[PDB]
Amino acid sequence: ESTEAPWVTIVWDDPVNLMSYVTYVFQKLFGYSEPHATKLMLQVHNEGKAVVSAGSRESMEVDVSKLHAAGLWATMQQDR
Ligand SMILES: [Mg+2]
């Protein structure tokens, strides 16, 4: 198949960061509203991970880097 396909950024639950911090980071880095950021934070915390953004591989690479700088456990993968 082709490599021009969409990717996602995933945040993984970590035992150190405050829930309030994670909500704030999603608002700050992605411009998300409070209800949206809180829902994603709670999904990370209750499911162990959440897709937080989606787009091209190169765009997701930026989101991962931004999240790492904020101290969050982020990875990216191709979306199937
Ligand atoms: Mg994390």
Ligand code: NI
């Ligand atoms: Ni998917």
